Amino acid sequence: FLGFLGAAGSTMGAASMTLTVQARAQQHLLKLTVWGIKQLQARVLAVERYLRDQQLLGIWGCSGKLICCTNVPWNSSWSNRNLSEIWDNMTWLQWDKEISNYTQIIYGLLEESQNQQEKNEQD
Amino acid sequence: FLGFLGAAGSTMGAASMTLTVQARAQQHLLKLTVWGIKQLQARVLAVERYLRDQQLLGIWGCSGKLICCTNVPWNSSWSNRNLSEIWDNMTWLQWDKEISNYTQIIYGLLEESQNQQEKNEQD
Amino acid sequence: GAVFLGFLGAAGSTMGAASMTLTVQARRAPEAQQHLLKLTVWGIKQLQARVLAVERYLRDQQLLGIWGCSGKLICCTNVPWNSSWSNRNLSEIWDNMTWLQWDKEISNYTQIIYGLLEESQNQQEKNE
Amino acid sequence: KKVVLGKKGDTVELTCTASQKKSIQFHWKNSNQIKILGNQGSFLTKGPSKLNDRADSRRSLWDQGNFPLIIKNLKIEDSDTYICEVEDQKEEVQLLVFGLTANSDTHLLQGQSLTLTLESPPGSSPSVQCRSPRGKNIQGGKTLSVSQLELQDSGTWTCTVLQNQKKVEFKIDIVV
Amino acid sequence: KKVVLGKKGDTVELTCTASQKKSIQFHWKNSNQIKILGNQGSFLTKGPSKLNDRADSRRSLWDQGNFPLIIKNLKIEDSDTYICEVEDQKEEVQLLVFGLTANSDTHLLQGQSLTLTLESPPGSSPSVQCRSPRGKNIQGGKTLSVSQLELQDSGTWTCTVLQNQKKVEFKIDIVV
Amino acid sequence: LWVTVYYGVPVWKDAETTLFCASDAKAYETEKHNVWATHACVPTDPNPQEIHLENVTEEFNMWKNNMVEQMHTDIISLWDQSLKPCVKLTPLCVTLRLINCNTSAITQACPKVSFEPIPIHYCAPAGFAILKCKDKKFNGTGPCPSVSTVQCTHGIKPVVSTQLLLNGSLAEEEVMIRSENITNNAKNILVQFNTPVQINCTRNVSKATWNETLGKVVKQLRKHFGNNTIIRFANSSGGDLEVTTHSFNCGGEFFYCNTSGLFNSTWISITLPCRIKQIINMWQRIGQAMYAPPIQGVIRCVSNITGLILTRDGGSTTETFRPGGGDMRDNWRSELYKYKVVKIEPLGVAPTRCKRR
Amino acid sequence: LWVTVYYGVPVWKDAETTLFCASDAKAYETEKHNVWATHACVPTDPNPQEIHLENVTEEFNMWKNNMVEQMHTDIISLWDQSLKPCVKLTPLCVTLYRLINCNTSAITQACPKVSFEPIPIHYCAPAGFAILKCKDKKFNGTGPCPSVSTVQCTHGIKPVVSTQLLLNGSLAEEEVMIRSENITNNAKNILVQFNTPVQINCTRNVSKATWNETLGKVVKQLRKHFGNNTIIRFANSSGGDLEVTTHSFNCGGEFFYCNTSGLFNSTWISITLPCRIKQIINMWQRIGQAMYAPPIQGVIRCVSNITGLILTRDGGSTTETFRPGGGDMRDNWRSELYKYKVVKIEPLGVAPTRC
Amino acid sequence: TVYYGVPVWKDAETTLFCASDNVWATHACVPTDPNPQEIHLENVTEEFNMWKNNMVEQMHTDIISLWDQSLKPCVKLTPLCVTLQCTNVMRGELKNCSFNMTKVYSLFYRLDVVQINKEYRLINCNTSAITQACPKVSFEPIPIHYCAPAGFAILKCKDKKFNGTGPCPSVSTVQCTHGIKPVVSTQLLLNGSLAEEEVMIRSENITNNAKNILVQFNTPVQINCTRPNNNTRKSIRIQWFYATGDIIGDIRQAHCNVSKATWNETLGKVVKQLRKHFGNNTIIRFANSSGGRLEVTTHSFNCGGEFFYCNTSGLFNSTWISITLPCRIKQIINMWQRIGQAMYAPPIQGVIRCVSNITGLILTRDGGTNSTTETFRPGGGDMRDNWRSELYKYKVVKIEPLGVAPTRCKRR
Numbered sequence A, B: 001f002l003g004f005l006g007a008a009g010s011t012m013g014a015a016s017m018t019l020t021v022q023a024r025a026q027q028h029l030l031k032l033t034v035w036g037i038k039q040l041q042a043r044v045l046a047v048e049r050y051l052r053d054q055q056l057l058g059i060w061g062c063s064g065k066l067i068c069c070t071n072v073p074w075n076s077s078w079s080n081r082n083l084s085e086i087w088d089n090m091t092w093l094q095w096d097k098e099i100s101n102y103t104q105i106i107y108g109l110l111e112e113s114q115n116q117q118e119k120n121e122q123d
Numbered sequence C: 001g002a003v004f005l006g007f008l009g010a011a012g013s014t015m016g017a018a019s020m021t022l023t024v025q026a027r028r029a030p031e032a033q034q035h036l037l038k039l040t041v042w043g044i045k046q047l048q049a050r051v052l053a054v055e056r057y058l059r060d061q062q063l064l065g066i067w068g069c070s071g072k073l074i075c076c077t078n079v080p081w082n083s084s085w086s087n088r089n090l091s092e093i094w095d096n097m098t099w100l101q102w103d104k105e106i107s108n109y110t111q112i113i114y115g116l117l118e119e120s121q122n123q124q125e126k127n128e
Numbered sequence D, E: 001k002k003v004v005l006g007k008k009g010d011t012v013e014l015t016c017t018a019s020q021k022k023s024i025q026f027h028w029k030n031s032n033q034i035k036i037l038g039n040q041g042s043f044l045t046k047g048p049s050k051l052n053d054r055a056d057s058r059r060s061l062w063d064q065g066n067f068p069l070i071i072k073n074l075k076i077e078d079s080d081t082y083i084c085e086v087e088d089q090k091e092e093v094q095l096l097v098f099g100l101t102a103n104s105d106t107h108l109l110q111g112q113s114l115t116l117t118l119e120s121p122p123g124s125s126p127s128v129q130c131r132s133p134r135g136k137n138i139q140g141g142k143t144l145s146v147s148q149l150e151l152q153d154s155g156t157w158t159c160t161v162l163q164n165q166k167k168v169e170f171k172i173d174i175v176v
Numbered sequence F: 001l002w003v004t005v006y007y008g009v010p011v012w013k014d015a016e017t018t019l020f021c022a023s024d025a026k027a028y029e030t031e032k033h034n035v036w037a038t039h040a041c042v043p044t045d046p047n048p049q050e051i052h053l054e055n056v057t058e059e060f061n062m063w064k065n066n067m068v069e070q071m072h073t074d075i076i077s078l079w080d081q082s083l084k085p086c087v088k089l090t091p092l093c094v095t096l097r098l099i100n101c102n103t104s105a106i107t108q109a110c111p112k113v114s115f116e117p118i119p120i121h122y123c124a125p126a127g128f129a130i131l132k133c134k135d136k137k138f139n140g141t142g143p144c145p146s147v148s149t150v151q152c153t154h155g156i157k158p159v160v161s162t163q164l165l166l167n168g169s170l171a172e173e174e175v176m177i178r179s180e181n182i183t184n185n186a187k188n189i190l191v192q193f194n195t196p197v198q199i200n201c202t203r204n205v206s207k208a209t210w211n212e213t214l215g216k217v218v219k220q221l222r223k224h225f226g227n228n229t230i231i232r233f234a235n236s237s238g239g240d241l242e243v244t245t246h247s248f249n250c251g252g253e254f255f256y257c258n259t260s261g262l263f264n265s266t267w268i269s270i271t272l273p274c275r276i277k278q279i280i281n282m283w284q285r286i287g288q289a290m291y292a293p294p295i296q297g298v299i300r301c302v303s304n305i306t307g308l309i310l311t312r313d314g315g316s317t318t319e320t321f322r323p324g325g326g327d328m329r330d331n332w333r334s335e336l337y338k339y340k341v342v343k344i345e346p347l348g349v350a351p352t353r354c355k356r357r
Numbered sequence G: 001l002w003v004t005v006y007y008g009v010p011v012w013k014d015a016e017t018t019l020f021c022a023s024d025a026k027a028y029e030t031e032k033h034n035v036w037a038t039h040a041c042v043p044t045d046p047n048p049q050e051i052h053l054e055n056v057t058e059e060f061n062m063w064k065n066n067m068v069e070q071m072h073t074d075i076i077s078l079w080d081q082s083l084k085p086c087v088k089l090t091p092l093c094v095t096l097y098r099l100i101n102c103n104t105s106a107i108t109q110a111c112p113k114v115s116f117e118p119i120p121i122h123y124c125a126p127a128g129f130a131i132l133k134c135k136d137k138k139f140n141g142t143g144p145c146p147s148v149s150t151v152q153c154t155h156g157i158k159p160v161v162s163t164q165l166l167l168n169g170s171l172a173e174e175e176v177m178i179r180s181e182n183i184t185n186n187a188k189n190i191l192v193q194f195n196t197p198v199q200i201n202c203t204r205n206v207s208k209a210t211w212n213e214t215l216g217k218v219v220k221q222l223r224k225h226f227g228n229n230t231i232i233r234f235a236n237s238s239g240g241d242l243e244v245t246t247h248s249f250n251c252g253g254e255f256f257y258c259n260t261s262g263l264f265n266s267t268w269i270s271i272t273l274p275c276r277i278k279q280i281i282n283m284w285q286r287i288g289q290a291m292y293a294p295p296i297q298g299v300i301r302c303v304s305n306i307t308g309l310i311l312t313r314d315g316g317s318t319t320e321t322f323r324p325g326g327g328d329m330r331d332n333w334r335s336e337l338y339k340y341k342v343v344k345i346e347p348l349g350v351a352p353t354r355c
Numbered sequence H: 001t002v003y004y005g006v007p008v009w010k011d012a013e014t015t016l017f018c019a020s021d022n023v024w025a026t027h028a029c030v031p032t033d034p035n036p037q038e039i040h041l042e043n044v045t046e047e048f049n050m051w052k053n054n055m056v057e058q059m060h061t062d063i064i065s066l067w068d069q070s071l072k073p074c075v076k077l078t079p080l081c082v083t084l085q086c087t088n089v090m091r092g093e094l095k096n097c098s099f100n101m102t103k104v105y106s107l108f109y110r111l112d113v114v115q116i117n118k119e120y121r122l123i124n125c126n127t128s129a130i131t132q133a134c135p136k137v138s139f140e141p142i143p144i145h146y147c148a149p150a151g152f153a154i155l156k157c158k159d160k161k162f163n164g165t166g167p168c169p170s171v172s173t174v175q176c177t178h179g180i181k182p183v184v185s186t187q188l189l190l191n192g193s194l195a196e197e198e199v200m201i202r203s204e205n206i207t208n209n210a211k212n213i214l215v216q217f218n219t220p221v222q223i224n225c226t227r228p229n230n231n232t233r234k235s236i237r238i239q240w241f242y243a244t245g246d247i248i249g250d251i252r253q254a255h256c257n258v259s260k261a262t263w264n265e266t267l268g269k270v271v272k273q274l275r276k277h278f279g280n281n282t283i284i285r286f287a288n289s290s291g292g293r294l295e296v297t298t299h300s301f302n303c304g305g306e307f308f309y310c311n312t313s314g315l316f317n318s319t320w321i322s323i324t325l326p327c328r329i330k331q332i333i334n335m336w337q338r339i340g341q342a343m344y345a346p347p348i349q350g351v352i353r354c355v356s357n358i359t360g361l362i363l364t365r366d367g368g369t370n371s372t373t374e375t376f377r378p379g380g381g382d383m384r385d386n387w388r389s390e391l392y393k394y395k396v397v398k399i400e401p402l403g404v405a406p407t408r409c410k411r412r
């Protein structure tokens, strides 16, 4: 999980190109049992968090795809700039700031995207 | 991350929405290590069960998705009744009894329909 | 946790038997010698095996989603089927060739095979 | 309607088989639906009847799927139907028990009449032909009266109970 | 601005208020922004003032949200405003002290004038309303000339000196 | 009319699973029950996270349970390993319908050791959970209005007793009487008392406490019946001596207490004549056991009477219920009634509301 | 413009959750420090992974950092486990201004002589989180760091309790540094980090002319913040409880408090410090007092290096005087971990690829 | 197109861990798992070469690592090596030694101590610091299972004719290996695992003289050797150092008893199989130990922590056409043929009785005597083969279920 932010501070295009491929006596006894329990609890928490993120991405229809396009258009009524300016001038780190005021719309579109995909499959 | 349990006996349709965003000192050490391992087994077993479920949904042709629709008919012999009333005054727990004797059958037919669909798409 | 399996019969015969097998797959501590802590240790070993199994499955699934499969046991690609590498008859390599020795014959160049598969998925990407 | 006849004082065997071989709960009910005997776990409980000391069961065969009921020191009133319900079936068994004995203890001489007593059970159609091997193939009902007492008038042969093509054997006490 | 009044040597309990009840770092400052008393974790420190040997705080009350300041043996030159800095407040409290004494403890006759001494704090505006048990509410300056000595002149007085509607009971040494 | 497949829905299913025991074994006692608990039982849960479920209707069947049979086998293992029969006679008794058949005698280590029944909780393994319906008006079959999921059952004492359940659980509202099928006899009666009935056994039952409980049970029976044909307690039916007598073990000695006097009341302090026998028949399996003579030390045993077992009689007036027992499965049924193992299955099947091809 | 989802974009947001301790506890030591470490920590990873980041600027605030609160609570628990006071008073004073006697509860506990030896400790964020580390040596405590680097486990911190002098860890990398929330405000503490440690030996004594040189470096750094006038002065400690007035610390044996007048008596334009072991203390963990057993007869010698200073300037009315008075232990733990911040990974996004 | 979920194994290398049931011979290893799972594999022929196999290489690594870990814990005897004034006291060959500590008397054998310049000293104490053998620890062999960590499987070949190489008819997957007896033995194997009724000979290259020949008998043969020695033990300060004590009674060379009939019959089976390997017409002979470094010439073994060197050259020499046996003991040590420190094992008080079963034997074929006589002199000294013999059937594997195979598919 901390590997991803290695790409931060780079132009969003190069960041996404990189995103296309990321990972492609009692002394011993106590070491084995309690230390192992906690160390392994950490790994289980890691896999559970990753599975939660994967599930959330799955509800939107893009299961197991790092990059994908959903048929809902971008909400343009609120202020937004042109695509070429977006992908080049900025980088992903401050791109969270541009949508932080959209956080409610974020929570909208994050659910809205899945609502569109399920309405297309149901219709 | 698991979503094992959920809403109680209620209109199964409303519960249909609820799942979508529902979840996605030490005196003696020997008591902790033999009991913590059991709860850790429970968590990893739930994770493996979720992975198996997603795998089965995938071989049915819809992996990741939570509300999967594909072409497969509702056979009349499967305790046919008015759909509306099952939606209003029926819950998942009570409805599990009415479809238990047909569960393997519908699994098999959905499976061969998925096989036919992928064969037709390929050829 | 699908990494656990032992059936290896389809190797000599048609691979399709393995295809049926994978589809089927898809669907106390006496304390006399302090056996309590011993059972905890063995349970730790087994549960570690399970968590490493699921981690390995996800590691393979990330790579399989790099190509256009992402969890499908039976994937499909547009790369040429041999004709440049192990140009043996399809019948013998699907019905006579043992799975393990077949996989060695492939691992001669399996890395470039994966590379061409990734290129295939890349071409499928943004096809539009 | 399987039926057995005892000696009215002997030990008779009644068995109901369970093909499941599990040693499970069973009881015994009479024609009035009164418990007489059964198991509770791995024990033996006798139902509140008038035959508590008189009847019992063979515990050893319960594990192998045989659950019997054995009555000792039989008598006339013991003749009634019984039922097994080992899992759910009501396997019925008919019991008609009665004996035939003598009453003329010592007042017998050359030519005097001897008397026999037969316990006629209510609700039956028997025909007693209790005989002897020495030559007394006599036919009679309750009383066995013979004008002359020769050597061919004593002994005990196969007693013909004759209840629906079933035959048993018991003793007749007469000696010469 | 809360104002408290002293008796030239008594104890004064200035109070802050912890709106959080968490005992978080605070500091007691004076008008010249010189530290007097301060919290450091769970200890207690004193800054470089004229009250280092005099300042004190009831330590036990901090955990409940009370941060008192105690100045025993108060002197007039120490009359200055004090400020808490509990979390972000600049709660300003003022302390005023002036001592009523008599230069002639015993040199007095029947009808001889009497001289009182009020060591007032410089830069202050006291209102000396000496509420004397003779019925003479004397409105005067630093000294009060008593032109007559009667037998009723005994008893401790209460020269309630008001300053911006701030009153407090007073026990001055007038004994006969 | 095309079915789809929803996921994550709440669906439960009855299943049979092996269960693991969680007993609070001190492990530093010479008594064999505790060392067995260390031998095959895990310690108890540090903190039980019982999750209440509302608006849940769950068909509870206390007689079609699995914990009762699992703990039956486990407690047989307990009694064989701990209270070892130092003369044990068992009929191997091979078949060949009549067949003569043999008995084998086995000798063992034979120490006179006190039996202290510490509670033995039962916990379902990973992936399954036990369900308890907390309604105080459970009648043994049907829906339980309130149901809560838990991982470990309440602590049970593996008591062994006949005609009187000892050290058992207490009913909350009424002294409940439960039978699988009450309309006809040959089915046991299971009673749960609100208040424990103290007893004293030495080598007496307090009156005015047992009498009021009998009044409560006859009130409950007349509630179940038509207020007529008054139930009166009577003698033991007869048969094997263990079932006819109040048989129980504490301190390693088998005490058989005649209970006819207490079941001698007709409804519209008392001392018990207890005895000790060297020859027993094990509840675990068919056979007979011989044990060592009792220790000279006076054995004082005080145990609450919590449950009572009866049997009905067929009739052509007043009801007479005979003391029953010997079926230890029914005994631990009375304590583990409100429990049911279940497995969760998120996958489900859907209505026709879709058209996608 | 069509919204498309990306998984794994390098996006983080600042947020606190519970961190987990990591210590290479030997677990075969009877000292209660290793006992606590092995009870409630995990072994350090043999291969810590630190990926450097380029062209990234993050705003660090050590003063408002909240991981320090977690470490302070954890060490409070550690001290409750390790040093068991066999006379303990804790004010209750239930309130319905000295309304009641507020009588101190008088818990009495076991009084064993257990060695208390500090051991290195690491804090690692739970999975799904990152611990940023500012590598810039010019970091003045608050504001942006031009260069940052991510590592799951911070550098080994020795949890060491001490007033008036930090010691046993956290050496400065390049230059002596001065940090403060508000250097103008007198109340806020001033943390000073030493580039070179000065060895201090205390026995049942500090190296001179190395203390002098470090002090000169400190006054230079202070003048850098000030106007090069108002000559810095050190003097008698301010006054108050013994723990703050004099250098208080413990090393295996009983804690002791040492006069530091010789240490701070210079005005900038071998040193022996009288130290007294006391059994009567004011607990730093919570308000109250404690009494301990008399110290062991065996000679106890402690070797340490004074890597840090805590100074508070006098009130303004000229010249500036600094006195050592750091008692709030949160300050000591802010000094060691001034450059670490907990942050949460949020690897999702939205972009206009036009399908 | 890819076929996920397919069973494939690539022979790999992984660090297996202990499974044991103060003494360093039984150190804190993991307890042996309670229900070792075993799954048979039908129709699976797995290639093997336990000479070159990855399991044997990595097992050498694991064995060497564990022996290194297991040697250190005992305390050392670094400075005690000094000049010693000793006088000699079936020649006994025992020297009583005095060293000036303020003089102390101790007992050393002739072979452990050589002349220096009467004046006597240890062979290599100056060159290599000598290590004392801890009295608490005892040198005892126990069955040690080997377990593969998670993600690795252990393959076991259950074939009687296996010979350790080539295809194996029946194979199985096992979590933990069967108990391995770590036993020190040269030109011979003690208390090892019983072999198949037919006798196996294994060699990396049958023609090569350099490659050793290892033979496993079908039936164990009794090898019990006794040393009737009544020794004592002394507390001589260096810190209380603990050394050899005075002797009561008469010393005897440890005599070992072997049944001549069963030994002859086992080697008769052996020469039958050797005729199979080298030609029945060829006449096969046996000879005594070849020679070389004293340790490798003689059979070296340990009982009760005491090492006896059976240089019973008559036993290995069995001249053919195709009883009690004396032995010495040693107190100075070169174990695993290490050039480093030499630990020192002082004697244990009381008679030493060692009972064991002969389970194997190692020879080295003479260079070719071509088809006329095939002398097979006992060869050994490499401790690799002893553990190598016990686990010929085991290998490590990893699973890579990512098969790719060419099938027709168009899709989109």
Ligand SMILES: *[C@@H]1O[C@H](CO)[C@@H](O[C@@H]2O[C@H](CO)[C@@H](O[C@@H]3O[C@H](CO)[C@@H](O)[C@H](O[C@H]4O[C@H](CO)[C@@H](O)[C@H](O)[C@@H]4O)[C@@H]3O)[C@H](O)[C@H]2NC(C)=O)[C@H](O)[C@H]1NC(C)=O
Pocket: F114, F115, F116, F117, F159, F160, F166, F167, F248, F249, F250, F251, F295, F297, F298, F299, F300, F301, F302, F303, F304
């Ligand atoms: C039901 O619960 C009750 C508790 O409510 C429980 O009763 C307990 O039984 C045990 C077993 O006898 C009692 O333990 C006894 O304690 C005394 C005093 O400590 C011991 O001396 C006894 O052991 C000795 O007994 C002999 C003397 O007669 C000695 O000769 C012999 O060597 C033993 O050392 C014995 O252990 C315990 O006190 C009671 N608790 C009470 C009455 O509250 C009962 O067992 C449970 N089960 C049943 C079926 O009743």
Ligand SMILES: *[C@@H]1O[C@H](CO)[C@@H](O[C@@H]2O[C@H](CO)[C@@H](O[C@@H]3O[C@H](CO)[C@@H](O)[C@H](O[C@H]4O[C@H](CO)[C@@H](O)[C@H](O)[C@@H]4O)[C@@H]3O)[C@H](O)[C@H]2NC(C)=O)[C@H](O)[C@H]1NC(C)=O
Pocket: G113, G114, G115, G117, G118, G160, G167, G168, G249, G250, G251, G252, G253, G296, G298, G300, G301, G302, G303, G304
């Ligand atoms: C900072 O780090 C230094 C690193 O050196 C550390 O110094 C240690 O302090 C202790 C206590 O002052 C020193 O004292 C003794 O060292 C010996 C040998 O290691 C130990 O055996 C001692 O432990 C026992 O001592 C008593 C002897 O009678 C026993 O009664 C008692 O119960 C103890 O078990 C004790 O540790 C130690 O030598 C140094 N150095 C090292 C390397 O430990 C210092 O404590 C740290 N903290 C501070 C605030 O300076």
Ligand SMILES: *[C@@H]1O[C@H](CO)[C@@H](O[C@@H]2O[C@H](CO)[C@@H](O[C@@H]3O[C@H](CO[C@H]4O[C@H](CO)[C@@H](O)[C@H](O)[C@@H]4O)[C@@H](O)[C@H](O)[C@@H]3O)[C@H](O)[C@H]2NC(C)=O)[C@H](O)[C@H]1NC(C)=O
Pocket: F181, F182, F183, F184, F185, F186, F187
């Ligand atoms: C469990 O609960 C059940 C409630 O549903 C109890 O029901 C019992 O069911 C049996 C049915 O076998 C009843 O027995 C009678 O069956 C006859 C059958 O008709 C003819 O058969 C007999 C000969 O076999 C003959 O004698 C009859 O006269 C008839 O000619 C019916 O006709 C009767 O009406 C009656 O149904 C039982 O009577 C009935 N129980 C009660 C109390 O009514 C069942 O008893 C319960 N079981 C237990 C173990 O508790």
Ligand SMILES: *[C@@H]1O[C@H](CO)[C@@H](O)[C@H](O)[C@H]1NC(C)=O
Pocket: F139, F140, F141, F142, F143, F179, F180, F181, F182
């Ligand atoms: C228990 O109550 C249910 C509720 O409908 C009923 O069906 C059942 O017969 C009752 N059982 C008994 C034994 O009363």
Ligand SMILES: *[C@@H]1O[C@H](CO)[C@@H](O)[C@H](O)[C@H]1NC(C)=O
Pocket: G158, G167, G168, G169, G171, G197, G304, G305
């Ligand atoms: C400073 O003290 C520490 C003990 O905490 C020690 O490890 C280190 O070597 C000393 N010197 C330096 C330069 O850090």
Ligand SMILES: *[C@@H]1O[C@H](CO)[C@@H](O)[C@H](O)[C@H]1NC(C)=O
Pocket: H087, H089, H095, H096, H097, H107, H246, H247
């Ligand atoms: C050395 O020890 C042996 C055995 O105790 C003894 O026989 C011999 O006399 C000793 N040597 C000397 C010189 O005392």
